[PDB]
Amino acid sequence: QVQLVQSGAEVKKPGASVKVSCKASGYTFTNHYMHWVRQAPGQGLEWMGIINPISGSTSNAQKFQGRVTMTRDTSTSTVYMELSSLRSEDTAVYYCARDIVDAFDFWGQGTMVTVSSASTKGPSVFPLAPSGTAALGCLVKDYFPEPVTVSWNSGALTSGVHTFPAVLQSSGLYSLSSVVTVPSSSLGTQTYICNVNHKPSNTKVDKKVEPKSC
């Protein structure tokens, strides 16, 4: 019945700082070192450092020297990770984890930190026009922050849909595609509309996708 509860997702500009919290409950806080580990989207795990809850003594990976500050508050059984001068490379899920001396046995739920020069922006939606079975889709380009939702035909079309995970572009904006496979014989008559919603920018786009006329 141990729980490590972390603070919510953060969106930050390059050069800014972020402070992530990790509140421990269900055990004696001072009995265990606490560590921080991060994981870039789709990638592996990277240790950041360790803090002693009794003394506050801390060490970190050399990569983070001068940029990471780890602190603890025994009154609230909370540990903090502050990472300053953020850059794109810091975009990751950050986890706190409890040391058991041979392992990490409980981890927080993670905190996503997104570092981007971008600000709130709704997407542009472009057709992936159909060239048996045909593929068509919508390219949902240049929005920030996550998430967008995509449905087809207002939710009436679900079979054969694949909505891909978003990718963060070098511009700091996200992009993703949603595709569906349908019968070629349906292309003349059945309307296919992708419904894109980006709540952070209050942007709703309903894009009809049709064969390109030549």
Binding site: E46, P127, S175
Partner: protein, 210 residues
Amino acid sequence: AIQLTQSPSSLSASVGDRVTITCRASQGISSALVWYQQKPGKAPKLLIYDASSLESGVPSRFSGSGSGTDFTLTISSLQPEDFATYYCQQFNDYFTFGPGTKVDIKRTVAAPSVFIFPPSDEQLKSGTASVVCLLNNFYPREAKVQWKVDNALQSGNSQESVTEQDSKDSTYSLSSTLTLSKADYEKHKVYACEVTHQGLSSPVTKSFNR
């Protein structure tokens, strides 16, 4: 500095299979080796520590063995909840992790169905061109997309995204997006995506002429 490697990078398995995955250290680490399981969107979960001690609450089908530079994790008879990525970790001195082994649901090889999409006129009016290549409903996950523009290999200007394995047919799909400036797009004629996969005897090309 200690580096951990893991093999295989990906393993196809079925319910009921005995599964063994391996972790190797660049120098001796001497029993201080941990195994974690991770599922999408969740934190890692502890399975084994001291390279052979099964943590309480973890099912007995899991076990680990090893010392020095070589370690294994075995699942004696895989169950549906065991499809996941597995990481090893040295529990000493930078606490480094191996790169993970994903265990996914085996099915027969399925070659991708490949589709290419030119940029829309609407997008081109704004100054950028996205060319999309879709690899649909394939298995195993390993696949390679190469972009060629007027027969020249493209590097540094594409990004890939992959779905999670489909619960109904056990396949993956993948999108690759090539980004060019409008001027660069208009300078060239032949746009090709070339796909390699276990199910293909040789690379398959889908292309269009701008």
